[PDB]
Structure 1
Amino acid sequence: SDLIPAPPLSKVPLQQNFQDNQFHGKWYVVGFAGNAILREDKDPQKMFATIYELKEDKSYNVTSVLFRKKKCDYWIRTFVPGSQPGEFTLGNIKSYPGLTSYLVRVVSTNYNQHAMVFFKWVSQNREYFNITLYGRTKELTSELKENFIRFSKSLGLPENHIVFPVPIDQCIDGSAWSHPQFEK
């Protein structure tokens, strides 16, 4: 079975006059849609966070923090500025065997609340992509979430390939200090 084909970059807008400094810091994964992700409601994906640290050389050190089994997991990698502002490629791709390309395109952001970012990669000659909806908080509006579904569908993704990860406290919010909620 083949994957839904990756859309042409023509269908994927680029945030105009992208501001690398304002994009920095922590984002939560509020939505995640892609040709290799399947929504599964019995044991749903938990929310994770991705921290973008802008380096002197204007690359990002990008650190994803996830809760997996009963430990914190990480994916640390470098996003190197690409051909246009708001585009990046994966640094040290030589160290990812079978990965022949990895492209990042910031679609839209207002920097202080939300962003949508497109990722496309090629691995053992198959084409993969996702769209991420990032929030500065763990919840976004229904409007931002329906916009994300719309955009996802415009790139060829049916609803069963669109996931809204369940908010969590462990690992991803190092300062939430959660406790039992009064009249939750």
Structure 2
Amino acid sequence: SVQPNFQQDKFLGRWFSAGLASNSSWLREKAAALSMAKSVVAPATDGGLNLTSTFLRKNQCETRTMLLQPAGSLGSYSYRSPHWGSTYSVSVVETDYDQYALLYSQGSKGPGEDFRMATLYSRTQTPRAELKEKFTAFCKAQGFTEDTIVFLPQTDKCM
């Protein structure tokens, strides 16, 4: 479930949100109309992570921050969303720290319990073929179909 021997300090820093797969068509569609700028992973006071995402929305730069509280094994987190009335499990399932990370999220409480999402984070804004295939292979193994896998538009604005 989690990356074996996960070391949080090496997962810190700048990542690019390069791909996502979800069983929510709404989320996929909304995300694709955004243009992703950098994400930043920083240490949180609670021992977990602050995940800060920057993106273009209708030509405006927007930033959103999510607190990833430590959940179970190292590399697993919980995200509580008052708006969605739900809590989500967020796990770093595989990473080499210096090129890519694969994240998997699903609801653990509330109406969001059926929500599922896989995320490709890349240290480079354009991940090479090997990294894209690691992501698609993971998505397929997890039951995401081809048309639910989205490579996300990027932008060099907002930074």
**TM-score bucket (shorter structure):** 0.7 to 0.9
What is the RMSD computed on CA atoms of the aligned residues?
2.1
Give 1:44 deviation, angstroms. Answer: 5.6
The answer to whether the 8 A contact 1:37-1:162 is kept is no
Q: Which has the higher strand share?
A: 2
Change (3 A) 1:80 1:109: same
For residues 85-137 of structure 1, the C-alpha deviation after alignment (integer angstroms, 9 at most, x for no partner) is 000012xx3x6144332111101111111100111125536510111110111
Gaps of 5+ in 2: none
* Among candidates 9, 15, 21, match of residue 33 of structure 1: 21
SS in structure 2 at match of 1:67: strand
Moved more, 144-153 or 131-140: 144-153
> Corresponding residue for 1:168?
155
TM-score scaled to structure 1, two decimals?
A: 0.75
The answer to whether the 8 A contact 2:106-2:113 is kept is no
> Corresponding residue for 2:102?
116
SS in structure 2 at match of 1:138: coil
Distance 2:147 2:153 in 1: 16
**Matched residue count:** 155
AA at the equivalent of 1:26: R
Q: Which has the higher helix share?
A: 2
TM-score scaled to structure 2, two decimals?
A: 0.86
SS in structure 1 at match of 2:7: coil
* Among candidates 5, 20, 26, match of residue 8 of structure 2: 20
Mark the structure with the bigger radius of gyration.
1
Gaps of 5+ in 1: 1-12, 175-184
